[PDB]
Amino acid sequence: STGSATTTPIDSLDDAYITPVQIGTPAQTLNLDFDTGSSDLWVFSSETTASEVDGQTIYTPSKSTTAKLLSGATWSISYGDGSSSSGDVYTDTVSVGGLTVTGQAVESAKKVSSSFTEDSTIDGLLGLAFSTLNTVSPTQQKTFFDNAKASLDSPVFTADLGYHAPGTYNFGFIDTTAYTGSITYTAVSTKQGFWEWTSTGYAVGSGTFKSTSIDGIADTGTTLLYLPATVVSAYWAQVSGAKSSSSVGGYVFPCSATLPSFTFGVGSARIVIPGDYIDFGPISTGSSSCFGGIQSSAGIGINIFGDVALKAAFVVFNGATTPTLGFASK
Ligand SMILES: C[C@@H](SC(=N)N)c1ccc(Cl)cc1
Ligand SMILES: C[C@H](SC(=N)N)c1ccc(Cl)cc1
Ligand SMILES: [Br-]
């Protein structure tokens, strides 16, 4: 089997991407944030505290003939950005782009934090990291990809995120028309539960490539590119007037600037992030100070190749017995 679904930016800055997902019988379609940095499939639901729902589409398990309460199971997750959610668990039929999993754990939110309430466009998350990170207790549950894997034509999914445009998540096959050149594969460590890999270095604009190992995670659920302070300082030093602002919480730059590209290494290959991908717009409405898309990972504890980086590439999440990641230009 295979599946193929379009993923769409939630706003004009590509702050996140939503992908339609069918849950239950008859189908209830919710727009979920596919997140390779977590491993819970959770949804706004008929059980979510009413004051914490503001425009999201909800899953109502009582209206699904295939929903079954997973007795005694609860979940609670807090994303390293400070947001959080928690609730109880059903199993139900879940389909993405024509690929169906029966008995998928669907985590129904009873509580969500304010940042979720305040985002009416995201109806939940679909985790695609390794199932060892799944928070369901007392019986940990498998991700959609892990449940689907043995049925797939090939045990892979691919992320092809667009810049200010829709893109695609594919399951079970590699669309050879969706990238240029070849796919370069690189080793993954699963020890922390993430798609963790080591970039071989970077370049700023037309500058020379610096060979240096940068350990990080491939995280579709993070908007920006978080890299060591040395690398980020070298990048922003090429932008007249850019500075790190403690009051704003990162590097900002004059909205009148044209930004240089940023290149990262994948083995001997190179992925080029165009400068425009690094512009996240005014820090507040009407401001001429713009927020940067490359920020320091100091204090996160890991580097994060978020959407800014991933959208410059066609990315293969290879879930074979020994997982690997693949990157191609596009
Ligand atoms: C791994 C992601 S959270 C996710 N993808 N669900 C993350 C952790 C910590 C920080 Cl500070 C920022 C991002
Ligand atoms: C999964 C990501 S966490 C991240 N951006 N690193 C997320 C999405 C929406 C909200 Cl409101 C909070 C967190
Ligand atoms: Br300002």
Swiss-Prot record:
Residues covered by the Peptidase A1 domain: 17-328
EC category name: hydrolase
Tree of life domain: Eukaryota
Keyword Cell wall biogenesis/degradation recorded: no
Single GO biological process annotation from the record: proteolysis
Family membership noted in the UniProt record: Belongs to the peptidase A1 family.
Entry protein name: Endothiapepsin
The organism's taxonomic lineage, starting at the top: Eukaryota, Fungi, Dikarya, Ascomycota, Pezizomycotina
The encoding gene: EAPA
